[PDB]
Write a structure and sequence with these properties.
- The structure is cut from a larger assembly and holds chains A (143 residues), B (136 residues), C (78 residues), D (56 residues), E (93 residues) and F (100 residues).
- Chain C has 78 residues and is mostly beta strands.
- Chain C has no helices and 8 strands.
- The N and C termini of chain C lie far apart (69 Å).
- Chain F has one domain.
- Chain F has no helices and 10 strands.
- The radius of gyration of chain F is 19 Å and the shape is elongated.
- The termini of chain F are close together.
- Classes of the chains: A alpha/beta (143), B alpha+beta (136), C mainly beta (78), D alpha+beta (56), E alpha+beta (93), F mainly beta (100).
- Chain A binds one RNA strand of 177 nucleotides through helix 1, strand 3 and helix 4.
- Chain A: One of its GO terms (molecular function) is structural constituent of ribosome.
- Chain A: This is Large ribosomal subunit protein uL13.
Chain lengths: 143, 136, 78, 56, 93, 100
RNA sequence: UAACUUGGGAGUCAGAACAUGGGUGAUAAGGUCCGUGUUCGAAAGGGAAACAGCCCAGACCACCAGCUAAGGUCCCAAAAUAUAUGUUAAGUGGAAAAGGAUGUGGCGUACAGAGUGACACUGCGCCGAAAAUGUACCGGGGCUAAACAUAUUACCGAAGCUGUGGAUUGUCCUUUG
């Protein structure tokens, strides 16, 4: 047995700044998901977090295809009888653009105690100004 | 009310109904015909309804032929009875039709009055149809 | 609310009992039938109930006897 | 010593008549091979189970 | 202008006959007097119209292997549902 | 420096002065083994490729010959009155690399 | 590579689903009664989201070794956001009919001044389409190709096969190997 194992004494996490200006929603969330999980590092370990931090700017300028701006709706239940609400994807982009990308990427992560910790390394903004300049974020191009 | 005058057995087996038509695939009496494209059972009451409508439109213009005959009967059980205790009783007579058979042939009219008398009669039948002429 | 049918008789095991080209003995049954659907041949006898049996030892031979008629014969092996 | 036949697919789920033809050729388990010369009766067995073996 | 022709060699499989009909070419057999039994191939459309002029019993003058033989149509096969000729028999007197 | 050696159907990454555990070999205690098949010679020095570097053997020294810790194999099927119990100890050979 | 004969000891007589040839019923039933094959029963492992009977395949034991089957390769989740040529705009794909429509492709036969009509056989779509705790028939996110058709070239993928080391039973029967 000689397989390597990563611990919290040799892991390095960096900060990225991705831009969502003119990008497809589903095809952009699938790439950010692998970064938050650390699927791009050669020292990947399953039982420990090894991903990095990601910052999404220009979220309000995401793109859809076809008529999905009206046919795609989001439901939610309040646990009360008959308490089911709804909202269309087109109306949500115009009010809460950050919750649109935040929930689209959270659904591509595992629903475990470690997956909830990896989903907090994400930051989404509707403009181009982020307050995390101290973290020294580095630009990233989608593949 | 087409029905055979007598039969040897009144309780028969039902036909296969799977496959293609055996014979009667051409027009040999009139100038036009109605060809079937699907499989289904045709009852005497359906044949009656489908030929009275054709006769009315043509206004006694020419001859009409019926190339099918309900030779086979079918039985049915009473209402709210359990399984078994013998076979049912005769209910009606049907005929088997498969893709490629002619049902009606008319003559003595033009090609336009004949294409409208067969369309009003093809809606009374439970099978799809088609217009066919004497093949050259 | 009843049935008038439901009767039948036991099945008889009719048909051929030996194959063509096979060796048999002097008293081997070769064909059970009703009437004469196959006629006896050389060294063959017809029983009381139309059963065909051999009379010597030899090979069996099913051959044709006229237009639309069949027979069975037995020839000694040399 | 002219043909080489190897069993690729298993015999589970096959009719008993086909399982008996795989025994006359001399095949025990999956991926097992055997060498025989091309005979008139040899090719009559492969043709019956040509969907299970791979003659080379 | 006499129509063209092709010679079917050997024995075709069910699939070969079906694909030949799909292309637009119908098989035929000529067994008339003065000729042998040869399998031929003729375009379906090319035959449909040349038969228009000569009619039912007119002379086809089909050419087999560089040798034109005067012939006539004896019998053919027709599909009423799909309206596609299947087989043609040429008889040479 | 290091090398990949094939011994018992597996491959290993060995350095000079390291302990390893492989399948039971033929040599007895205190003898000297020699790895004929070397697949890769790594490090910053001159490396080589494949399939197998002709030569460049490895030398080791046999230290111990024992049996791994006991393993218990148990299986059963519910409602069928069928069970089975087994024991197992896998033998091994402990070596020590001398020079690549 | 079996078969047959003689003798000692048994168990079994409630069966099930799928494919297929039929009777019965209503060309209803996870219905019922027979012919034929397979699986379960008495069978783990991989696939079908979960799912004795469906597809692939039959576990002697150990290993942080390799190649494959069914089924797969955007993320959950191991492997192509592969290549070539075409079709569909409906979320079709990811539930249904009779009928109704210059929706859009392919292959064949003077009309209000150089473009208009009429048919046959066929691809992929549309309307017809209304149930009761909550999205509620893609497993979820999501997707316009990550859908469909015709091919090519890689890879992932079982307790199947192979490699290595050990158990028990055999057949080997001429240097206990």
């Amino acid at each position: 047995r000689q397989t390597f194992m990563a611990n919290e004494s040799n892991i390095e996490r960096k900060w990225y700044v991705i831009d969502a200006e003119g990008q497809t929603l589903g095809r952009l969330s699938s790439e950010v998901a692998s970064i938050l999980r650390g699927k791009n590092k050669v020292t990947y370990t399953p039982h420990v977090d090894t991903g990095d931090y990601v910052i999404v700017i220009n979220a309000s300028k995401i793109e859809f295809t076809g008529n999905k701006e009206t046919d795609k709706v989001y439901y939610r239940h309040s646990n009360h009888p008959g308490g089911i609400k709804s909202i269309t994807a087109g109306e949500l982009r115009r009010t809460n653009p950050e919750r649109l990308i935040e929930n689209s990427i959270k659904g591509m992560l595992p629903s475990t105690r470690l997956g909830e910790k990896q989903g907090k390394k994400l930051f989404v903004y509707g403009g181009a100004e982020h307050p995390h300049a101290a973290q020294q974020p580095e630009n990233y191009e989608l593949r | 009310m087409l029905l055979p005058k007598r039969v040897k057995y009144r309780r028969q087996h039902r036909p296969k109904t799977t496959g293609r038509s055996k014979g009667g695939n051409y027009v040999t009496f009139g100038e036009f015909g109605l060809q079937a494209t699907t499989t289904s059972w045709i009852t005497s009451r359906q044949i009656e309804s489908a030929r009275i409508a054709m006769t009315r439109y043509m206004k006694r213009g020419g001859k009409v032929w019926i190339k099918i005959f309900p030779h086979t009967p079918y039985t049915k059980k009473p209402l709210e009875v359990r399984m078994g205790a013998g076979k049912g009783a005769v209910e009606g007579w049907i005929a088997v039709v498969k893709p490629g058979r002619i049902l009606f042939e008319v003559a003595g009219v033009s090609e336009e009055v004949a294409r409208e008398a067969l369309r009003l009669a093809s809606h009374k039948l439970p099978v799809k149809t088609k217009f066919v002429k004497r093949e050259e | 609310s009843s049935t008038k049918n439901g009767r039948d008789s036991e099945s008889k095991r009719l048909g051929a009992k030996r194959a063509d080209g096979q060796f048999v003995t002097g008293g081997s049954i070769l064909y059970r039938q009703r009437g004469t659907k196959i006629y006896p041949g050389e060294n063959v006898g017809r029983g009381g109930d139309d059963t065909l049996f051999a009379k010597i030892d030899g090979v069996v031979k099913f051959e044709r006897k006229g237009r639309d008629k069949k027979q069975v014969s037995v020839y000694a092996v040399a | 010593a002219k043909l080489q036949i190897t069993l690729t697919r298993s015999v589970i789920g096959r009719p008993e008549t086909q399982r008996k033809t795989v025994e006359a050729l001399g095949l025990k388990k999956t991926n097992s091979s055997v060498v025989v010369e091309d005979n008139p009766a040899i090719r009559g067995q492969i043709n019956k189970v040509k969907h299970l073996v791979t003659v080379e | 202008a006499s129509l063209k022709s092709i010679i079917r060699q050997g024995k075709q499989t069910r699939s070969d006959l079906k694909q030949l009909r799909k292309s637009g070419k119908v098989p035929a057999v000529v067994y008339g007097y003065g000729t042998k039994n040869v399998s031929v191939k003729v375009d379906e459309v090319e035959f449909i119209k040349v038969i228009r002029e000569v009619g039912r019993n007119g002379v086809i003058e089909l050419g087999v292997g560089s040798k034109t033989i005067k012939v006539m149509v004896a019998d053919y096969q027709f599909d009423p549902l799909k309206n596609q000729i299947t087989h043609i028999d040429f008889l040479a007197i | 420096m290091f090398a990949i050696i094939e011994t018992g159907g597996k491959q290993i990454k060995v350095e000079e002065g390291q302990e390893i555990f492989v399948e039971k070999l033929d040599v007895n205690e205190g003898d000297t083994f020699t790895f004929d098949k070397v697949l890769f010679v790594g490090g910053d020095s001159v490396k080589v490729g494949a399939p197998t570097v002709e030569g460049a053997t490895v030398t080791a020294t046999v230290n111990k010959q024992g049996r791994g810790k006991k393993i218990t194999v148990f299986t059963y099927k519910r409602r069928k009155n069928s069970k089975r119990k087994k024991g197992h100890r896998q033998p091994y050979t402990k070596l020590t690399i001398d020079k690549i």
